[PDB]
DNA sequence: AGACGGCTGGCACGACTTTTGCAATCGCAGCCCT
DNA sequence: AGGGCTGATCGTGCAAAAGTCGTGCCAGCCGTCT
């Protein structure tokens, strides 16, 4: 089989489309919020607990820029599904599962 | 025999010519095809031993 | 008042327009397609027939034959190597020594390779792995029974008079082979009926591929060539595409997209130029024709491309390659717009133009050419003179029509 | 190259042509069994170069040079009969009309 | 190649028991596929080649 | 599976891959000679959809 | 039986073509070099 | 504090040299008739 690099990311359409969306819980994002993130509309705060916007929080572009001005690069907010890519790249089960 | 076997079809035809009466299972091509279809969609296809 | 070359006098496309018009000079279907792909910008520019029949084409037949034939691992490998490099006609492309070298085995020798090649030749069709020419003929003759008459002389002609018959040296064949006069002809015919290039018989299916770039149709007897309107490339500008380009809000990217729209409008001029030129000049060329082909190829003269360009009246005699790299299809078939141009072949008799008409006259002459030779330069030239073109032996084309000289065309009857 | 009904089938058995016409058609009232040729066109193929092997082949046998590939029609397998009647329609401007 | 084992090399099969079904990694995606595609061309009308 | 001899007339996912090949080209087009941050704004969404 | 014939084409010279081979000056003024 | 210089932008012809085609037509040769 061939391949493709796919610079514009493509999370598995099967992944999280199901009603028991595992990603929608690991990121804990709302289903409509997840739809906006895929639709590149959420602009959700990508990560970082230090910044005022929560590591997993829908961040307004104005709010994201304001938090960036406040704390350097601590404000990260992606509208596209790369937000979810981080939100799962950051969603941790390392001894967190025992706490849960 | 009555399925998609190609290399098994040739072996079986040769055996029937020779009167050997043996079929070689191997693995169906449709199996690897479905594996690819899995790899074609967003999931790797990997079979353990 | 009067005119003068010297006066206070108040242009020529440069760079951008050059590549633009080159898109017209290039073919639109593929030559322009590569550049269009190379663009990579201006985002504001937009039962089941399934059948999978696996034909063997006699290669799998040979494989089943060797597999069903009693053979050892080395014998099967040698047979497979022999079968691998086979030409379409049926003669082996490579030599037996090359087969032994590719085997890469010291035990593999010329004798084993020859035995394998004979066993393969001892399989359908006659002359398998011929390598040497006429091996199909020799195999068919050997397969032919000795009860057939003239078989001995046929084998003599095939084995060593192969050049004698190849030169059609029937007198020399009779003098050297000492075969009976006018009786060796039967042996030569028997040798001829031996399935030359029998392996080419297996190959009978080739895909059909013809691109009508201006499809004139005559099921109704006449129709607009349509310039293959659907196939004509046409980029689409979209308002939402402009919005998405604005989403590419980068100022450098914005300037790039603006200059890209500029060059794309230029290229639109190029494609419109190609299409309008090959539309108007083509309508002019088909004006000579009535109800599709009026008099076949005898409907045009040496075409002045400058004349058609001046007919376009803008790049008047400013020649190019837009109708070139474009072909108009008609009831007979596909013929180029370069073929819509023509050359002078008629020389006297009120003739100074058109090579197709003179060639068609020559073709009608070939319909009644000489039997001992293609219509002699006297015969063909006199036919052309009867046409009044007077192409002369200078056009007498015969060697160009894959016709050899006169005496070499004399052969046994 | 156009495929035309000329009954000129290279590398073919003679008995097949025994029922064909110069047009290539079969005369009305014939018998038919097996895969008997019905309408024999010859699709011309890509032209060859000087091609010394093919040059010698055209010098010895000639007239075919494998230029025409069999574009012929044949009777169906397992359907046999007797030809009742025929018809033909050619694109206007084509005046073969042999048989 | 000895032309006797390379031909024999093509035909082989494993028992392949305990067939598993699991997720994916991009490195494995690169390893499984032989190349990456970038152009929309499939087949041409000029000479009928890949 | 060509239909009339001339045109392959491929269908479905490969045909979809055709448009995806556009994106596959567009990704390469996004890779160089386009601003991926500015481009993927509307491009990446259609990319995920396709 | 050696010379005609007509084929042939090579040898040569004019006439239609025809791709290619040519991108700049404006516009202030500001920023950079002096 | 004074100079320079910069380039944002500036697209459907036609011609240059060169060839290539038209056209004939001269040298040789072998089929022939001598």
Q: What does this protein structure show overall?
A:
- Chain D: DNA-dependent RNA polymerase (RNAP) catalyzes the transcription of DNA into RNA using the four ribonucleoside triphosphates as substrates.
- Chain D: Belongs to the RNA polymerase beta chain family.
- Chain D: It comes from Escherichia coli (strain K12).
- Chain D: This is DNA-directed RNA polymerase subunit beta.
- Chain E: This is DNA-directed RNA polymerase subunit beta'.
- The structure is cut from a larger assembly and holds 3 copies of chain A, 2 copies of chain B and 1 copy of chain C (413 residues).
- With 100 residues, chain A is mainly alpha-helical.
- Chain A contains 5 helices and 3 strands; from the N terminus they run E-H-H-E-H-E-H-H.
- A two-stranded antiparallel ribbon of chain A has the order 2-3.
- With 49 residues, chain B is an all-alpha fold.
- Helix content of chain B is 49%, strand content 0%.
- Chain B is built from 2 helices and no strands.
- Chain C is an all-alpha fold and 413 residues long.
- Chain C contains 18 helices and 3 strands.
- In chain C, helix 8 packs across helix 11 and helix 14 crosses helix 15.
- The radius of gyration of chain C is 32 Å and the shape is flat.
- Classes of the chains: A mainly alpha (100), B mainly alpha (49), C mainly alpha (413).
- Chains in contact: A-B, A-E, A-F, B-C, B-E, C-D, C-E, C-F, E-F.
- Chains C and D meet through loops of C and helix 2 of D.
- Strand 1 of chain A pairs parallel with strand 1 of chain E, so a sheet runs across the interface.
- The structure holds a DNA duplex (34 and 34 nucleotides).
